[PDB]
Structure formats: C-alpha cells, structure tokens
Symmetry: D2
Subunit: 379 residues, 4 copies
C-alpha cells in the first residue's frame, strides 16, 4: 500500500463549505472568491498591482497554466531539486518548448551562482524554481537566485506549493512573475484549487499576446472571473469548485487573524523543535545543507529500520508521515505545515521514538522528546 | 448583473465532506472513489468493460480531456444546438485538429438524418453531441443519431452534463465512446469534478497510442489512479478534490437507493408538470420541437416583461432560474434537475405566476398552478 | 404509528453546534448564552429589568420550574383550552398546591370576562394561561385577560411555547410574571431547552423566599449561571446542553436580523394564506372563533377521509402535519411556525389538495392553491 | 475566572446531529434512541432484564430522578467522597426523606467495612455511591462495597458520571439498582442527557408504587417513551433533546466498534502513563490511596505555583485541566476520559512540565515526558 500523510484541516474550514444553495453567481460565492483573491496577495506579499487567480485542480494545474505565458520554441530553464522540480519538465514535454534542467547532488540544492552562470550563457524566456522540494524537504534560496538572474531572464516562476503560508514569501519585493501554490498544503484548506499570483509583466503577456495554452488552463479564460469577483460581479467561464472556494475563504480568514509573520514564526519553531528532536535521537536529516532545512518537510534517514514499516505502524497516530522516494536515501518524511502547533512537534517525535524503539532503529530513547520540550520552552 | 440558479444539494451530500483527516491515500478516500466510479457505470448504463474516470474541474475539463483520444489533423464533427455544443469548437481551436460544426435553426436540434448525411459524405474520426443543450433546454435524440452514424465514424462523444442522472442514458447499449458529465448538475453533488465513461475502443486508444493532450487533462495520467482505486489501492498523479469526491460518493449512494429508472421518472413527471403549468398560462417554450423538451431545463419566452426583472425579483424565492442567452429569443430558463420534487414544480409555477402578474406579462393567472396539480395528481 | 411534524431547522442553526472543544466555561459558550438571554428579552418585548433564564429540557421543564415561585397550599387558577393547558394541572398534582381549572367548549377559548369573574370570586396566588393551544390551534387573548385580572392576582404565567417568535408578545407592557417557551417550536432551533422571562416581582420571590421546587428545576439554582453569563463569567450549577445553546444563539442571530415585527408579519401572512386555501376547499377549521385562529397551528376538520391516512400519506412531503387529539373533532393539524415562508403555504395546501382528492374527501380541487396564491400576491 | 476543561468530542459524533428534519416521531430518532438504550446496557454490563432510560439534563437530573423510587420518610445513606457525593445530600434536602452521609478524610474514600458497619446498625431504603469522585479523582471500590452491603439494603444507586465508558462497570453482576451517567463525560458525546439503568427490582417500584418525584423527573413518565422506542414506536411525554440523542447514538456506535474492554484498557494505560509522568516530576497526587487513583481524573498538588496560574497559561494548549476545589489541598485536576489517546498523555505531561518550569514549581524537568514514553512503549 501507499500512505501519504494528509494535512489536518481545521473543522471551521471544512464547515464553511456547508451552504447548500450557493452557486457561482451567489453573492456569498463572489464575496468568498474576492476575499480569497485578496488573501492570496496577503500571504504572498504583494500589492494590488499583482493579479491573483484561483483555478480548479491543484499545484499541478497551476504549474501547467504557466504555458499561458509561452510561445512556440520559447526557452525554459528548470531548476530542479527533485520530484516536483522534475514535474515542470514532464509538463513542458507536452508543449512545443525548449527545456533545460539543472539538478544538484541528491538532497542538495542548485546554488544561485550555478543558475546565474546558466542564464548568462543562454537566453531564457522562463526560469522555474521550486521554493520547497517536497520529496527531500529542501528549501531553495529563491530570493538569492532571483537577485542574481532577474536581469537576464524575461520570466521567473516559483512553485510554492510547500512554502506559501509557512515560509517567508515576498512575490513583489523579489520580483517574481508567477508565484503559485495549491489549497491543500501549507495553506491548510480543502483540496481542489490551484492558486497563482502574476506580476504586471506576466499580466501584460496575457492581455496582449497569444499562447500555446489549451482551453481550461489558459489563464486568459479565468481572468474575467477573477477581475469580476473583485468588483463584486459574477462571471462565467467554467464552473469552479464553489464550496472548496468557500472553505478557502475561511482558511484565509484564519490566516489573516493569526497574521502571516506569526504563521511563519510558528512553522519555524515547530520545525526547529522537530529537527532538534531528530538530532538528539541521532537521526540524520535528508537535506544536505542546514541553511536549506525547509520548515514544512523533513526527511528522516533510517540506518536499520524499514521506512515502509515506520509508515505502516504510525497510520492512526495523528501524525503527517509520508514515504521517501529518492533512490539515494533510505528515509521517510515528516510533514509539518498548515495549522501545525507545538503539540504536533511533541507528538511527532514521541511517535517516532516509540515506533523506532519497537523496530530496533538505534536511537537515544527519551532524548528526542526532551530536546523538543527544550526548544518549545526556550521560545 | 448575472444570476444563474444553483442546483440545490441535499445536506447529506455536503455533510459527507466533513472528514478532516482524509487525503488521497486514506482508505476512506479510495473507497469513495471506487464507489463513485461504479456509481458512474450505473447512472450511465454500462458494464465493467467500460472504464470510468473522475477528474478535477467540471464538464469543461471533461470535454477537453477528449483530446486524449485525438492525433494531429484528426477530423471532428460537432453537432451543436447552442452554447455548450459551441464550446466543443472553442476547445478544439486550441488543438491541431479539423473541426466542422452542424447547427440547426435557433432552439431546434440537428436531425439524425442531417448528421448521417454528413458522416457518409466525409470521413470523421470523432462526432461530438450534446445530450441536453442547457442554453435552450433542447434534448438531442442521441440514440437515434448514433444508430444512424455508428458505422461511419471511429469515435462518438456525448456531453451529458445536463442529462446524466435525469434523462435515459445507455452508454453501452448505444455504443458511445465517451459519455461525460459533471458533479454539480443532474447528479446534484458539489462542484469540482468532471466524469467520463470510456468504451473499450476509447480505452485501447489510451493504452496503445500517443495524443495531442496536455498534461493535466491527459486521461492516461488519471487511469492508474482510477484502476488503483477499484483494486483498493492509492496511487498519485495529481491531488484530486478529495472532499468533493467524498460528497460525490454520497450522492451516488442516494442515486442508487432511489434507483436510476425511478430518478428518470421523477424528472419526467416534474418537467411535464412544469411544462403543463407554462402552457396553461399561455407561455411559449423556447425549444421549437416538443419531442426535444428536456426534462432538466425549460426556456420560457416573455412577450412583454423583461427576463432580467423576472430573475431579479425571484432571487430569494427557492427556485432555480437562469438567464436566456440566445439572441433569437427573449426568455429566462427554469432548471429542474437533481433532487427536484413535485413541490419544486408547484413552487416554480407559483413564483412565475406571481412575478409575471406583478410585471404585466399577459398570463392566465391561477391556471398554471391548477395544471401542475393535475399532472402531479395523475402520476 | 404516531407521526408529529417536526419544525424545520435552518442548516445554519444546526451547523452552529459543530464546535468540538467547547464546554460551559468556554468564552464561546458564555457569549452564546449571554446572546441568547438578550435574544429572549427581545422576542418577548422586555427591558433589562426582566430576567431571562435558559434551562435544560423544554416547555415542560420550564412550566414545572414555575413551582420555584410557589409555597405549600398556594392557590392556582389554570385557564386551559386543551392538552397543553391541562398539562399545568398534571404538573401541579405533583405539588402541595390548590388548583382550579377553567375550560371552554371544545375548540373555543375562555373569555377574559370568565377569568375576571373567577379571580374576583377567589384569591389566587398564580394564574396560568396558554398563549396558543397547540392541540386545537386556538390563540388566547392573553393581553385582554391580563388587563382584566392583573389587580386581583399575585402572579401571572403564560405558556408561549407555540407563540413566542411568531405571535405578538409583550411580556413587560402586558405585565406578565413568567413568560415561557421552548427552543424547538416558533423559535425554530434545536430541542433541549426551556426558556423563561421573569418580572421583577417574580425575581424578588426567587431572591427572598423559599419554595416547593425540587433541585434541578429550582430557578434559584440557575440564576447565578444566567447572571454570570451576562457579566461574561462562567458559573456552574449543572451542565447545560452546551451545543444546543450554541445553536440557539444562532437562531436568535437570524431572528434579530429579520426583526421580530417582520417575523410576526410573516407568520400572519403564511397562516392567513393557508387558512384562505382551506376555506376555498370547503374545509372547516377546528378553532371555533376566528379572532382566535393562531398563526402557528391550524386544525383541519375532515368529514369523510381518515386523518390518520392523511398523515401516513404526507410523511415525505416536506410539510409539518400532526394528529388531532380532541374527541370532539375529527381532524389533523398543520404546523406553520419558525422559518416558514410563502412557499410553505403553497406546498401545504397543494399536498392537502392532492392527498384529499386521492382519499375522496369532498373538496374543490384546484381552488385551494389559487386562493393561497391570491393572498400571497395581495401582500 | 472559572475554567473547566471540556471533554473533546469526536467530530463524527457532532456531525451525526446535522439532520434538519428530524423530530421525536421520526424513524431516524426512534432508531437512535433504541440504539442508545442498547448501548447503555452494553457499557454498563447488563442483559435485557435491566431497563435503560435516557432523559433530558445530565448527571444531576439523573440523580434527582432517583426520587422516583422513594416514599415519604425513606431512609437514605449517602457515601460521599466529595463534591458530587455531597450533591446527593443537596438534592435530597428538597424531598421528605431522611439522609445520613458518611465522609472519609479529605481525598480518601469510605472503606467497604465502614459502609457495612452502618447498614447493619440501621435499616436503609437506599444507599448512594459515587464511582469516581470528580472533585478529587478518587475511585470508590463500588464492587467491594456492594458485596458487603447488598443483603442489608433495599436499593443501591451508583453515580457513574465519571466512570461509565472508562472504568469497569458491571451493573447486573454487582446487583446495582440504579447505575447512572451523563452524555458528556467518559462517554464523550454532546451535553444534554442523563442516562440510567434500572434493575428489575427498581423497575417493579416504578410499575407498582407511588413516589415523591415531581413531574419531569418521574421516571414513570419517561418509561413509555423508552419501551416504545425499543419496539420501534414513537411516544410522547415531553420533547427530548432530539439531536443530542442522534449524537449519542453515534458515540455508542464508536464505543461498540472499539469494544468496552478495549476502551477500559485504553483509559488504564493513558491514566497510568499520566500518573507515571507526575510521579517522575516529583508531583504529589491528590487521591490519598493508590488503589483509588481513578482512570478519568487526577488531582495534582502544587507546593509553590498557584493552580489558577497553571490553568490560565494552559487554556489554548489542547488539554483538559480544571480547578481543584477542596479546601484541604492546593491543586488542579487533569481530565483524561472519553476518546483520550496516548498522545493526550504525552501532551498533558509536556504542557505541565513547561508551565511549571515557567512558574518555578520544583520539578525534575524532562523526567515526566520520559516516564510517560516508557509506559506507552511498554503497553
Ligand atoms: C512542491 C509541490 N509542487 C507541486 C505539487 C503538485 O500539487 P497537486 O498534487 O496539488 O497537483 C506538490 C504536491 N505535493 C504532494 C502531493 C501528493 C503527495 C505528496 C507527498 O508528500 O508524498 C506531495 C508539491 O508539493
Ligand atoms: C451541457 C453542458 N456542457 C458543458 C458544461 C460546462 O460544465 P462546467 O461549467 O462544469 O465546465 C455545462 C455547464 N452548465 C452551466 C454552467 C454554468 C452556468 C450555466 C447556465 O445556466 O448559464 C450552465 C453544460 O450545461
Ligand atoms: C403550548 C405548549 N406547551 C407546552 C409544550 C411542552 O413542550 P416540551 O415538549 O418542549 O416539553 C408544548 C409542546 N408541543 C408539542 C410537543 C410534541 C408534539 C406536539 C404536537 O403538535 O402533537 C406538540 C406546547 O406546544
Ligand atoms: C461524578 C459526577 N456526578 C454528577 C455530576 C453532575 O453532572 P451534570 O453536570 O451533567 O448534572 C458530575 C458532573 N461533573 C462535572 C461537571 C461540571 C464541572 C466539573 C468540574 O470538573 O468542575 C465536573 C459528576 O462528575
Ligand atoms: Ca470554531
Ligand atoms: Ca440524513
Ligand atoms: Ca427513436
Ligand atoms: Ca414565438
Ligand atoms: Ca448560511
Ligand atoms: Ca469519520
Ligand atoms: Ca475487590
Ligand atoms: Ca502532601
């Protein structure tokens, strides 16, 4: 069997979807969409000059919709740290475009200098980055990368599926052209939506040029719906996931009530506490470089125990554990994103200690939970 | 302003989505997906030889995913009775294919003989039909069309967004290659999913040939998820709308409990009652030919009153009314599909009588409600 | 079998109860209780000098809690128009008190003069009235009764279970000492609570005297909880139905948003429309005197059809029908209270027409629904 | 301020109450009541000869309803270990009965021999016990008490509000005449109901004798409702909390799915783990005698820190902490009952360690969490 840990959704978020006479023209729907659109500007750090869109699907449909900005034979550079970086390449194989991929050593990340070198050597229409690579837990220093490449490339896109709402994101200040995410990860809402924030530059391409996009994923077709909503008007392109968007509006209400800076600090603390627990047990982290330890995903190397058995025996344990699928390592991953609290840190390390002791993975029993406690106490 | 009436969702359906620890690998999700896949075979009248898929989006994403069955320069005949027939052509303009469209007089439908004539004259890879054309309330005699064209064309696709779960559908008996619908219409569940049933012939194309499809809407990419689910296995292509699918499973449970034959009879009675009400008021129906009066949508011609004012004054009135957007007629539309009951028939005609009397549309006040009562009594 | 029609609850009301970490000391609970307490002053027409209480149970526990105001051998006059008036007497048999009951002819009501005559003849500590007698649909002219008896009696209590939130109620202006109701009737919330509004006179009895009350239903024990809540403080006597009270707060929000005067007008219109439908069918109303036709309950006399069969064949019909249990009449009752709309009037009469036609009760088929339409149109 | 920790309710339990067209005559309600009645026999260990009742209110209304079994001047012995034992005496002061109370030293419990001595010296109609005394966390050895007193007393009643569903209960085997609980404690459902299980002997009293009971709390009045439900019949005495009972049925489904023996073991393990944590910190438990350490409540003595500050700083910390209200001790209490898991044990001790360290209560920081881990590993 396959077992990937699901991001826990606050009941308030889910319950916001229980309105049984709401459609895409309902004032309640239009208001939730307009609210979510502003919520997206807020979590991504951008002013009204940046255009938000919320489309059906997820991170993957959002990624593919970037073809809305491309023309035949356009040159694309993908900076891929693993599975989800590689998905850009799989998507672009379906399109008449030219793709080059940079990859680092397993579990590492592509340095800003290496990207800079490549964009000076060849002219690229588009550069794709992955803010956090979910398969390895590695955060790319996207700000540093962009500072170096901004003047050599027409467009920069960042996959923030595992970062937005949890890691610092400054789409406008960093001059990103498309920052995208999904509803079900670090935002902690129900699945079904892709979310995008476009620069004025990307928006001009939409408004004035043709593209290689299909029909459903051409952001041009969704623009009138998004623009209409902010003016309090209903418009129809294709039926969106109405109740999932009601749920998203409620997630954004909770996000705005906590405050994004506070949200980020919470993810830093929880992740730091979890990592301190892992280290005190003598467990090795998958991410090669400490400065890249993402605050949403941590890969945990096992020397003796079978990762698959760790996952099988922790299914009903109130944790978010998932398989490690990189040939270079034997590991499982801990998801720690969304509504995650200090108690989730304690639980994750406790569940880990007890499971690994049972399976004979050499660990310093007791030391993990104590180290977690220490971190949580000290801040 | 734009106001389209929303299909009322049974609360039980919505409430089935309130499970806050479910992801695409959860056995609860896998079971709901497998159940919904079987439910789709059931409402469409097909055996295990036909392959169901449930994908993110809606009717439009389902329609576009038909490109999964096409090759460059393939010849397509679209039989379009209005807006949603025309959407096939709009979708196919994004693809390297050759499209011819047959259209009838406004509010009429393309006769089976006219389609037969065209497919004998020229060779077509694909013929696209719309079972019920939502913009006009016209039901295409799809069975009759197919009987005549089956031996002259490789593939037949039917858009059943406004028919499946309400009109008779026999995908297997009629030998349709793709029968498709959405979650939010005559099935009466929450929005966010497209649904497809493929013949063995269409499935062989998927399994053995390349196509002009993009990435997200290539049915090949969803097949392992659908096949896995029916064997009780989780598989990942892209995150689906997990909770919308939980809701869909519950809608299919209610559909199977009523029985599809009974469901169809209910839609026939409610629609017949509503139409009898309209006629007794002296109101003219948009559909030109009575044999094509769909049992999910009825267009109502106004001679004096402004359709927009009818819609504005019936917003909180517990009905499903929508604008008429065909230049050839001045009208509004009544949606009567999903969980619709005899009481909905009475309400719709009563709300119509009272609104039109207020606005001076010449009608036989009182006679509508009486005629509805008569029909509901006699069945 | 027994079949009593349930008051339909807005989903928003129910959904307000889905908070899974709320207890009697939670700020959310205290706020909902304080809100509901004010909501009770509002629907009953009283200033802050009147003391609201919300206790576990229903109308019956509220009625019994009136013993909190009594002493051994106190004299009580019950003005009983049927079953629920008679319940006062059944309750008081359990207590060392002296009870006299006035009853009118079946389906009539006790005139104000008849009560006045009795309270001048003997001295009574307490007079009990029923605002609307649910078993017959008869509204007592409580204002007129009180105007006549106020100076001759120490305490006046009014059972408003079937009136509060639907009929005009002015507890303060009319000088009532206890006005009581339940959560599940004309207020349209979930069952589980009795609700009481006490005059300063009744409150002084609580604060300064002993009583014959038991433990759970001694309003003295609940007072500190109610007083605490309005000061934003939690207090414990016995655990209340926490989530039912969350639901009640939401019902009061909806009531206050509509406005009580508007609520009353809606009940008048719906009831008048239903009665006009009944009359046009040639059906006789149970209430003997038109000025007493309650706007929450209407008894419908059948000359031929069996009331029990009317009820059996209308169970899934979206109506609120209940048995007639008074030996003097052959009838069923229509409940029309709470969130009831003009559409409910149309439905009730339509369901009645179709059911009675099937069962051979002589009626003027078609005429009922037309008369309802006319009433709803004319206001 | 007063802050008592709320028992966390599984969302599934709450969500079972979202049926908006259900009343006391609905077959859905009757089925939920019948199911809950059987569920009550199951959790209390009794065959069909024992009669369950579910009444509005809570533990307190259930306790008072025991007056249904009493006659004027009946002699009662209350075995009270604290607040909730003392509530028997407070209730009985409202009734013409003779009460004697046995009390132990603070935080201790009345030995079976001490009760035996008293019932042999004087003749008692009724002996009242508290299975777990919530105010001190002390479990009375009710089986041992009953074995000694059974032949000397007519009736034995046990308050199991904090024991039923968590501690071993054998109502039939131990020959208890009334075993009672509430919906919101160790059963973990929504508040609003009292629950009783009566012996054949107590039932004969109901069926054949008069009593000193009031009206609402006379178990005679509820019996036809309970008997009717198990024969699949609706009956009316007073409106029950319909949706709270739907929720209760769902709680009983979850209890029966786990199995009562397993439920008991879970409470033993979680409580043992929590206590091991407390001891390893050097914290003293309020219960004087280890054999009486209840598995639902533990009192924690503080030597230096203010209990009130512990409560104030742990409000949003996902725990169930409550004040200690016995003058003889300075303490707070930990609730660990219902759906409580091993993770709740870890969290409670961690939250305690971190809070007390902050407030300078002398503890062995780190040692609590380790001891909890050890216990959870070894079971
Ligand atoms: C960085 C990143 N980019 C793109 C996607 C694709 O999103 P959708 O699935 O919404 O199309 C993701 C999604 N991440 C994802 C999805 C499913 C499983 C796991 C796992 O942890 O094993 C991770 C992701 O984490
Ligand atoms: C026959 C038909 N085909 C395709 C679609 C597209 O479905 P999605 O929107 O789920 O992609 C539809 C949708 N039907 C539809 C959708 C929105 C509004 C109205 C209206 O009545 O104006 C009708 C439809 O009715
Ligand atoms: C006027 C009146 N007074 C007291 C009560 C008792 O309330 P509780 O049940 O909440 O204790 C009521 C309740 N009314 C009631 C209850 C059950 C059935 C029916 C029916 O219409 O057949 C009516 C009532 O309508
Ligand atoms: C043993 C026991 N007996 C009777 C009751 C009364 O139950 P109701 O409240 O449902 O009538 C209880 C209630 N237990 C209870 C209730 C409220 C607060 C606290 C606290 O921890 O301070 C404890 C109890 O714990
Ligand atoms: Ca909440
Ligand atoms: Ca239901
Ligand atoms: Ca035919
Ligand atoms: Ca015409
Ligand atoms: Ca709402
Ligand atoms: Ca569940
Ligand atoms: Ca023993
Ligand atoms: Ca001590």
């Amino acid at each position: 069997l396959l077992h990937v840990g699901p991001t826990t959704i606050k009941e308030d978020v889910l319950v916001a979807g229980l309105e049984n006479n709401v459609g895409f023209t309902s004032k309640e729907f239009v208001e939730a969409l307009a609210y979510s659109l502003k919520g997206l500007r807020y979590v991504m750090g951008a002013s009204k000059n940046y255009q938000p869109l919320i489309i059906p699907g997820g991170g993957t449909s959002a990624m593919e919709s970037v073809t809305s900005l491309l023309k035949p034979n356009d040159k694309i550079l993908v900076v891929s740290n693993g599975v989800f970086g590689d998905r850009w390449e799989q998507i672009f194989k379906r399109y008449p475009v030219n793709v080059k991929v940079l990859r680092p050593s397993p579990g590492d990340y592509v340095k800003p200098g290496e990207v800079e070198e490549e964009v000076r050597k060849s002219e690229y229409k588009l550069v794709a980055l992955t803010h956090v690579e979910t398969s390895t837990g590695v955060r790319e220093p996207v700000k540093d990368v962009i500072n170096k490449i901004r003047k050599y490339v027409e467009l920069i896109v960042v996959d923030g599926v595992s970062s937005v709402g949890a890691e610092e994101v400054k789409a406008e200040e960093w001059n990103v052209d498309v920052y995208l995410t999904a509803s079900q990860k670090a935002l902690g809402s129900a699945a079904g939506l892709g979310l995008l924030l476009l620069s004025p530059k990307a928006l001009s391409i939409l408004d004035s040029q043709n593209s290689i996009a299909g029909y459903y994923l051409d952001l041009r077709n969704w623009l009138p719906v998004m623009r209409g909503a902010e003016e309090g008007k209903a418009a129809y392109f294709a039926t969106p996931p109405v109740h999932v968007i009601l749920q998203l509006a409620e997630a954004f209400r909770l996000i705005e009530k906590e405050g994004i800076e506070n949200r980020i600090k919470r993810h830093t603390m929880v992740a730091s506490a979890i990592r301190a627990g892992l280290e005190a047990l003598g467990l090795e982290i998958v991410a090669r470089r400490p400065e890249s330890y993402s605050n949403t995903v941590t890969g945990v190397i096992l020397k003796v125990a079978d990762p698959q058995k760790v996952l099988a025996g922790t299914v009903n344990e109130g944790v978010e554990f998932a398989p490690g699928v990189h040939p270079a390592f034997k590991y499982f991953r801990i998801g720690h994103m969304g509504w995650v609290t200090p108690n989730d840190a304690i639980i994750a390390i406790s569940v880990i200690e007890r499971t690994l002791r049972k399976l004979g993975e050499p660990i310093r029993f007791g030391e993990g939970v104590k180290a977690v406690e220490e971190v949580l106490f000290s801040a």
